[PDB]
C-alpha cells in the first residue's frame, strides 16, 4: 500500500468500524473517524466508500497528502464518484498540483450525466476547465457546486476576487455547508482580506465544531493580522483536535513573536495542556 496506515489502530479489532467512523464524523471527531476508516481500508481495500470517507476526513483534518492517496484509491474503484473528484481538485489546488487539480475538476464535471455532453502551470487545461464550467453554468445557472468549482479553479490561478464572488454565491445557496464557508474563507484569506475570511470561518466552525482545517485557517488569518493571542488560541485548539510538527513549529513562531521564550521551550515536549491552560 502507498497509504501509511497508523500502526496499533484499535479499530482494527472492532466489529463494524465503517459504521463507527460514520458516527465519529457525525460527531465531528475527525482524527477518530480517520482511524476507523483506515481500519476498513486495511481489511477491505476494495471498499470504495471507505477510501472516500478516509480521504474526505483527512483533508478536513488538515492532511491533504493523506487525502490524495486515499482519494486516488476511491477514484480507481469508482471513477464516477463525483465527491472524490471534487475533493481531489481541492487538495491538489492546496498542494499546487495544477495539472492534477484541473484533471479532477474536469472529471468532476464530466462524470455527471447532466453535464457529460496566462495560467502558466497548465494554460490550455485551465482554459478548457473554465469553458466547461461556464458552459455548465449556462445549462444550470444556480448550481452551488458549479459556483464552488469555479471558486476552486479561480483559487488555482490566484484570481481571488472572481473566486470569492463565485463562492459567496455558493454559500448564499447553501449557508449550512461547512466546506463552502471554509472555501470562501481560505479564498478571502489568500486574497488579503483576512477579516472577512474570519467571519466565513466562524460560520464554518459553527456548523462543524471539529473542522480542524478551519481552526488552522483561523490561526493563519489571525497571524496574518498579527493578532497573536488569537492565533495562539486557535492553533492550540487545532493541534489538540488534530491528534503535527509543522503546527508545533508554527506555534513556536507565535510564541517567539509575542516575546514568550518560556513558552517556546515548552513546545518541544509537544504537550498541549500547559498551552491550553495558558491561553
Amino acid at each position: 500500500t502507498d497509504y501509511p496506515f497508523e500502526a496499533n489502530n484499535p479499530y482494527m479489532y472492532h466489529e463494524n468500524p465503517m459504521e463507527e467512523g460514520l458516527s465519529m464524523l457525525k460527531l465531528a471527531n475527525l482524527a477518530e473517524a480517520a482511524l476507523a476508516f483506515e481500519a476498513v481500508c486495511q481489511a477491505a481495500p476494495e471498499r470504495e466508500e471507505a477510501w472516500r470517507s478516509l480521504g474526505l476526513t483527512q483533508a478536513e483534518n488538515e492532511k491533504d497528502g493523506l487525502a490524495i492517496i486515499a482519494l486516488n484509491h476511491a477514484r480507481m474503484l469508482d471513477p464516477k464518484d463525483i465527491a472524490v473528484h471534487a475533493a481531489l481538485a481541492v487538495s491538489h489546488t492546496n498542494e499546487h498540483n495544477a495539472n492534477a487539480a484541473l484533471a479532477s475538476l474536469r472529471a468532476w464535471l464530466l462524470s455527471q450525466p447532466q453535464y457529460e455532453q496566462f495560467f502558466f502551470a497548465a494554460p490550455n487545461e485551465y482554459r478548457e476547465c473554465r469553458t466547461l464550467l461556464h458552459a455548465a453554468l449556462e445549462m444550470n445557472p444556480n448550481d452551488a457546486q458549479l459556483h464552488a468549482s469555479l471558486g476552486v479553479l479561480y483559487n488555482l490561478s490566484n484570481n481571488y476576487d472572481s473566486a470569492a464572488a463565485n463562492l459567496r454565491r455558493a454559500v448564499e445557496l447553501r449557508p449550512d455547508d461547512a466546506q463552502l464557508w471554509n472555501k470562501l474563507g481560505a479564498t478571502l484569506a489568500n486574497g488579503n482580506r483576512p477579516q472577512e475570511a474570519l467571519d466565513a470561518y466562524n460560520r464554518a466552525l459553527d456548523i462543524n465544531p471539529g473542522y480542524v482545517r478551519v481552526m488552522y485557517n483561523m490561526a493563519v488569518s489571525y497571524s496574518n493580522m498579527s493578532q497573536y493571542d488569537l492565533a495562539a488560541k486557535q492553533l492550540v485548539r487545532a493541534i489538540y483536535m488534530q491528534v503535527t510538527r509543522s503546527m508545533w513549529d508554527f506555534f513556536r513562531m507565535l510564541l517567539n513573536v509575542m516575546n514568550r521564550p518560556d513558552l517556546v521551550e515548552l513546545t518541544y515536549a509537544q504537550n498541549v495542556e500547559p498551552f491550553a491552560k495558558e491561553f
Binding site: N182, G185, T187, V220
Partner: peptide, 6 residues
C-alpha cells in the same frame, strides 16, 4: 503571509 487551505 501564510497560506490558507480550501
Amino acid at each position: 503571509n501564510r497560506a490558507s487551505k480550501l
